[PDB]
Amino acid sequence: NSFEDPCSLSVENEKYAQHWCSQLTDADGPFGRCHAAVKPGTYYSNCMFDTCNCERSEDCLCAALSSYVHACAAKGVQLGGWRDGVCTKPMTTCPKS
Amino acid sequence: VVRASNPAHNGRVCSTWGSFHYKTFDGDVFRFPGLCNYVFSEHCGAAYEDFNIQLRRS
Amino acid sequence: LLSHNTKLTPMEFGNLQKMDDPTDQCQDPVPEPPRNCGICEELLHGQLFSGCVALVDVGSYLEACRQDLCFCEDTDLLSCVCHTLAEYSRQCT
Amino acid sequence: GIYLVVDTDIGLVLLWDKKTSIFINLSPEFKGRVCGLCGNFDDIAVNDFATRSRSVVGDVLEFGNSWKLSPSCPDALAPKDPCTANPFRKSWAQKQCSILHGPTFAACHAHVEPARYYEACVNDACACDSGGDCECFCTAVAAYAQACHEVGLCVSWRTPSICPLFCDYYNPEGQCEWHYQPCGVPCLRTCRNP
Amino acid sequence: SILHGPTFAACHAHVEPARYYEACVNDACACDSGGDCECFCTAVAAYAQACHEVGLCVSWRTPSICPLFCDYYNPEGQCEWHYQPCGVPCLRTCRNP
Amino acid sequence: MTYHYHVSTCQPTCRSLSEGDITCSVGFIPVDGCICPKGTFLDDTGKCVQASNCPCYHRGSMIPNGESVHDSGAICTCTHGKLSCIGGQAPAPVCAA
Amino acid sequence: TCSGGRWSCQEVPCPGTCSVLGGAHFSTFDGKQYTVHGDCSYVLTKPCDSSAFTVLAELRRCGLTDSETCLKSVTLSLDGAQTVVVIKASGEVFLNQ
Numbered sequence: 001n002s003f004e005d006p007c008s009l010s011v012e013n014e015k016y017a018q019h020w021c022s023q024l025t026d027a028d029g030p031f032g033r034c035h036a037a038v039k040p041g042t043y044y045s046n047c048m049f050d051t052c053n054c055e056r057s058e059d060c061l062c063a064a065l066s067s068y069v070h071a072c073a074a075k076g077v078q079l080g081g082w083r084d085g086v087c088t089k090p091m092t093t094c095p096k097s
Numbered sequence: 098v099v100r101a102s103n104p105a106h107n108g109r110v111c112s113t114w115g116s117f118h119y120k121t122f123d124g125d126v127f128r129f130p131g132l133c134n135y136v137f138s139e140h141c142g143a144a145y146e147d148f149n150i151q152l153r154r155s
Numbered sequence: 156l157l158s159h160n161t162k163l164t165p166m167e168f169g170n171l172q173k174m175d176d177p178t179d180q181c182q183d184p185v186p187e188p189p190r191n192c193g194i195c196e197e198l199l200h201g202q203l204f205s206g207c208v209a210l211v212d213v214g215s216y217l218e219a220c221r222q223d224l225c226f227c228e229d230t231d232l233l234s235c236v237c238h239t240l241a242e243y244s245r246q247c248t
Numbered sequence: 249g250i251y252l253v254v255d256t257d258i259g260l261v262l263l264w265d266k267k268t269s270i271f272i273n274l275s276p277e278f279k280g281r282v283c284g285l286c287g288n289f290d291d292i293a294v295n296d297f298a299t300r301s302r303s304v305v306g307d308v309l310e311f312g313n314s315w316k317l318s319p320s321c322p323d324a325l326a327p328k329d330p331c332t333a334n335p336f337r338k339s340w341a342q343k344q345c346s347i348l349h350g351p352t353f354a355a356c357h358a359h360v361e362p363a364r365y366y367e368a369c370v371n372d373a374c375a376c377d378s379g380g381d382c383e384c385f386c387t388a389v390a391a392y393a394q395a396c397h398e399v400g401l402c403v404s405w406r407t408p409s410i411c412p413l414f415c416d417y418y419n420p421e422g423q424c425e426w427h428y429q430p431c432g433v434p435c436l437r438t439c440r441n442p
Numbered sequence: 443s444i445l446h447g448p449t450f451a452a453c454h455a456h457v458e459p460a461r462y463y464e465a466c467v468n469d470a471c472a473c474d475s476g477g478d479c480e481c482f483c484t485a486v487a488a489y490a491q492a493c494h495e496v497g498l499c500v501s502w503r504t505p506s507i508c509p510l511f512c513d514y515y516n517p518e519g520q521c522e523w524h525y526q527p528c529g530v531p532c533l534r535t536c537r538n539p
Numbered sequence: 540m541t542y543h544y545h546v547s548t549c550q551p552t553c554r555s556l557s558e559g560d561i562t563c564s565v566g567f568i569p570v571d572g573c574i575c576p577k578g579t580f581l582d583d584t585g586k587c588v589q590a591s592n593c594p595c596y597h598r599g600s601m602i603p604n605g606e607s608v609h610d611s612g613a614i615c616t617c618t619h620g621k622l623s624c625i626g627g628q629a630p631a632p633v634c635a636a
Numbered sequence: 637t638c639s640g641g642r643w644s645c646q647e648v649p650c651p652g653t654c655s656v657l658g659g660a661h662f663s664t665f666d667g668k669q670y671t672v673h674g675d676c677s678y679v680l681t682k683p684c685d686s687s688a689f690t691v692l693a694e695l696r697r698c699g700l701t702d703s704e705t706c707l708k709s710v711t712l713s714l715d716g717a718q719t720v721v722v723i724k725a726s727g728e729v730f731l732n733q
């Protein structure tokens with residue numbers, strides 16, 4: 001285990017990760033109804049690292065957001081309507097019926 | 098104390114020109130016709146990066 | 156050009172040095188076969204750049220000038236090699 | 249060394265770096281019989297956030313505020329992000345705390361994880377904006393240095409530019425005895441230990 | 443205030459500490475980007491050098507006020523390097539045998 | 540898929556391209572029915588795609604386009620349905636006695 | 637329960653949760669969190685004194701660098717490998733090969 005910081009290697013990647021992953025820690029955002037149930041700090045760190053590191057940044061950002069949403073659902077909190085703004089594509093990709 | 102009396106310093110210069118011609122700091126000259134966003138030069142030799150330059154063509 | 160005891164080509168190295176935008180996915184350039192294509196020989200080897208030959212080798216810049224002359228899209232062959240000559244002058248300085 | 253050690257006969261040891269650092273060593277005879285901001289010493293870390301009302305909470309602020317001595321003292325609030333409120337210092341912080349990731353502590357990286365120490369160093373350097381950045385940085389690095397020393401790694405990190413120690417200040421007139429020791433001298437001959 | 447207290451009491455009759463104190467305060471106020479202790483140490487060392495130039499060698503550095511890591515220069519097992527306010531203009535070296 | 544009166548060969552697949560072998564009886568009485576048209580291959584999903592759209596396979600595992608694998612110190616990236624390895628081709632690894 | 641201004645708490649049965657997120661972020665049953673980018677198949681959970689169940693994760697480097705790890709498959713082994721279920725990242729499920 002080294003001590004790399006992927007967000008420091010790219011300005012645009014860091015900007016994208018900060019803009020789209022900070023919604024996890026935003027108390028007045030789509031995920032604000034869960035801060036009492038699940039602490040979003042670890043999920044925010046995972047979001048930043050994954051978005052800055054992996055080539056498909058949107059995929060890793062969506063994975064981190066979905067992981068936080070699943071943890072909230074496990075705790076009993078529903079955050080429906082959290083895909084407005086980002087991660088819209090999977091909502092329009094399932095089969096015809 | 099570091100002494101340097103040789104004005105020839107092409108080793109500290111890297112450049113790109115013409116139809117995707119790149120000259121590295123070490124004198125290597127090649128052609129890479131890439132139109133994407135590439136890291137021209139960044140300071141990866143330390144924990145803290147002093148500089149990071151990227152160039153994009155069209 | 157050595158990833159792990161492997162001689163990298165300039166294409167591979169340049170693609171390795173890629174850093175893409177978040178929403179902008181980029182396609183790596185397709186390696187094209189040569190087009191099978193000497194103005195630069197007169198000026199680069201002439202006296203006009205003589206005081207520069209002894210310091211900077213001209214073979215790489217000769218090849219660069221040939222590539223620029225062959226790859227450029229207008230028949231201003233005399234005026235389509237200015238970039239390589241300017242770069243060689245910069246390196247000489 | 250740089251430490252002041254208070255030893256008690258009940259099994260309690262305190263190391264004090266005399267500026268901001270305290271290290272309380274408690275004997276195993278006190279397991280499950282203590283409380284406060286240091287936990288309850290029962291090998292479980294999640295329940296260490298037990299308030300003075302004897303209830304484990306998830307909010308660090310509530311757990312900390314429940315342990316204030318005076319009930320009339322105002323409750324603490326969540327502080328601003330130091331490197332965000334003070335961006336003009338951030339680079340310096342990242343340039344100074346990178347000692348914890350370089351070859352200086354390379355031998356210790358396999359025995360003590362420096363992630364939290366580096367984070368604390370950067371945060372303190374960003375927040376040490378009212379005077380005394382070097383003290384903040386030296387305390388943050390000395391925490392990791394003490395963690396390394398506890399597991400038997402005698403790593404030397406203090407240079408004349410990085411947290412110097414004035415050992416020669418203790419030399420009497422015409423004498424040279426005091427020397428810097430990274431792991432210290434555990435058994436050095438003295439009057440109380442002939 | 444170190445530039446006005448007992449630390450530099452002897453030098454006050456030989457070097458005026460007015461402009462040095464003003465520069466100290468201004469630099470410490472303006473050293474807000476990181477490293478204010480360096481600013482303070484430089485500001486006080488200017489007055490210290492002014493004092494030392496006129497024959498007064500005051501010892502102002504303490505482990506809490508601009509410490510000097512002289513022991514860093516001691517070779518393994520040796521103890522030779524000491525702090526000198528006056529300096530040693532003619533220590534014996536092999537460039538001045 | 541397009542209908543065919545005479546089907547004596549076997550339906551090519553992306554897995555057939557990857558492994559180089561197909562699961563078939565070679566010789567059987569010709570049949571009829573809808574098959575993938577000539578110059579087209581059938582993927583695991585069930586649609587007919589061109590040779591440029593067939594996924595890469597390594598160790599029997601599907602490698603998506605743009606993904607990479609690390610085998611015996613060689614990094615092989617799957618692009619345009621082909622697994623191109625850094626260094627041209629991975630040499631046969633040799634293990635000491 | 638509240639009594640005399642103090643909370644008296646009783647423990648209740650409580651299931652544990654382990655999580656592998658992003659292919660590199662692990663959160664154990666006891667809440668410990670870490671991040672290692674593996675390149676092999678690893679033992680996630682298993683009884684120490686038996687082989688009633690065993691969960692394996694195929695964390696493989698899926699990029700040019702060594703810090704881009706993908707979870708390609710999850711293996712659930714039951715009753716001394718007498719019931720093996722391999723679930724791949726593509727949604728395919730293999731029961732007993």
Ligand SMILES: [Ca+2]
Pocket residue numbers: 287288289290291292293294295296
């Ligand atoms: Ca506890």
